[PDB]
Design a protein around this ligand. Structure first.
Ligand SMILES: CCCCCCCCCCCCC/C=C\[C@H](O)[C@H](N)CO
Ligand SMILES: CCCCCCCCCCCCC/C=C\[C@H](O)[C@H](N)CO
Ligand SMILES: [Cl-]
Ligand SMILES: [Cl-]
Ligand SMILES: [Cl-]
Ligand SMILES: [Cl-]
Lengths: 282, 49, 282
């Protein structure tokens, strides 16, 4: 008491259908905007022209981020060939990174942060699309859990990790996954480094790598002591569900080159829009 | 020396802020820890051997 | 509200006379003290011996700091000789520093800070004690005011500074002075430097100098266009009044050497107490 110096405006609204149009006539300066402020023109039809009444029942439900994202998309293709350089071992460990396929990636990168649960579907077959009576095991190996070093590895005992056993002939396996980041949300962009220290050019592959997005390894194998005679192709589809998103940003307008960064082909910088001869001719 | 674990917490050794902690303890319930199918046996019936 | 971490025991007493003594008998451990704490024994007569009742009316009024300090003491001796090296000029400018005389100085240095008003008395005469019909002018020249450069100096016009005109034959001149420091109190000890910068050995005379104690200059002259034939001796006495004091400290036990610092003769360090031959003999 003996010292006197020690004593968000915007909100939501539910709009199920597009706004309507009201009538007006031959009649305050609402046509000229001060776009220098960083605001979008609040001028509508009724201001610049004479209008009729239109009872607009067009629905806005399909543009809800949920209907936009909750569509299963390809995020990975894993192959286990029998003859070659890949894995004549009968098993494969895949670091989880969903940024290897553009269609989905570009959609997510529309936002800076995203939080959601997901439905993963596992479509498996031979490289030509044929199916055979082969038993498989998919296992989720969280960060810290021991990764299988072979098709015989004890890790396939899967006493605590979650594993799925399914035949290549059964329908696609399918499961639900919760929001697992240790942060409040996954983030497609992390303008920083994961650790302290000097950031010499040798460790610049560190830039942009966010541990909170690193969900571990996904392992798969044929279930047998002996090698399987079949080459295997596994396509993993992901369907986002129960999603929330923050901070929209410009959409990628240059082809993707790498999973972990926004590097672009500097010699061939594509223009966002097609070109024409003259500004006065279509 | 008694065989007891320190009943001293944050508020005792340092100045703290109020934190409304909603972290759930359901996953460490022995049921969620054990109710995960695990391999307990491998039985083989070969034809030649 | 959305954050929960953002939401003197001793007093005075009036004792006009010394505390009394009450009776006791042949009877809790009040004789043994824990002086390790930094406390003075709260054990009195009634605890260590059998006592009688004594109605003690001894007064504590004389030990009040006011009666202790409000006794005029010599703080300066200013001389204006006619034949010599001093001031055959007829005027003198004296920087005000009251630390040139021990009796008073030691008393004040009992405290660290002191605030008070004062009564200055000016006893003037010839060097042999004789008096003559000589007119004098004493003037207070505050910091910033122009100091007289001669007996004719315009500064003696004293249009704003306060001046006193008195004859060497009139009784001593006497005036009251207010508490003039720009600080809350004068301080006999200032453990620091007056300005910023490096404190090279060339400017070490700065250490301990506190501007808040520098009250300016005291000027005096004979009132005449012509030189006076009389040597003059001025003794200035000061009587502290309306005083308050803080933070008592050890009393000087070494002879004073300089006005502005506590330097002491290192080769001859005096013991606070006289000595004897044996610790078992008086
Ligand atoms: C037995 C079923 C196993 C299925 C387990 C799959 C868990 C996958 C969790 C989805 C994690 C979202 C992706 C997060 C971050 C991005 O990939 C990062 N940019 C990679 O550094
Ligand atoms: C015409 C009458 C003129 C009389 C004016 C006398 C004013 C003197 C004010 C008393 C100041 C107290 C002394 C203060 C500080 C000490 O002298 C310091 N240690 C000096 O550096
Ligand atoms: Cl096994
Ligand atoms: Cl959703
Ligand atoms: Cl004059
Ligand atoms: Cl007083």
């Amino acid at each position: 008491d003996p010292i006197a110096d020690m004593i968000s405006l915007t909100a939501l609204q539910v709009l199920p259908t597009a706004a309507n149009t009201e009538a007006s006539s031959h009649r305050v300066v609402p046509a000229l905007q001060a776009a220098e402020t960083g605001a979008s023109s609040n001028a509508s039809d009724k201001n610049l022209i004479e209008t009729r009444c239109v009872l607009n029942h067009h629905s806005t439900q399909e543009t809800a981020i949920g209907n936009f994202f909750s569509r299963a998309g390809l995020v990975s293709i894993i192959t286990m060939p029998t003859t070659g350089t890949q894995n004549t071992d009968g098993y494969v460990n895949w670091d989880i990174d969903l940024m290897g396929y553009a269609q989905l990636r570009r959609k997510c990168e529309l936002f800076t942060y995203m939080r959601f649960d997901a439905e993963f579907t596992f479509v498996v077959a031979k490289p030509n699309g044929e199916l055979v009576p082969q038993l498989l095991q998919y296992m989720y190996v969280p960060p810290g859990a021991p990764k299988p070093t072979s098709r015989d590895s004890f890790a396939w005992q899967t006493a605590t990790n979650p594993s799925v056993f399914v035949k290549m002939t059964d329908p696609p396996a399918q499961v639900s996954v919760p929001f697992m980041s240790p942060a409040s949300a996954y983030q497609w962009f992390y303008d920083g480094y994961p650790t302290f220290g000097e950031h010499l050019q040798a460790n610049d592959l560190d830039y942009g790598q966010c541990p909170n997005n690193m969900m571990g390894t996904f392992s798969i194998r044929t279930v047998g002591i002996e090698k399987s005679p079949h080459s295997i192709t596994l396509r993993v589809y992901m369907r986002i569900k129960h999603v929330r998103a923050w901070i929209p940003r410009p959409l990628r307008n240059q082809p993707y080159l790498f999973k972990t960064n926004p590097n672009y082909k500097g010699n061939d910088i594509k223009c966002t829009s097609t070109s024409r001869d003259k500004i006065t001719t279509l």
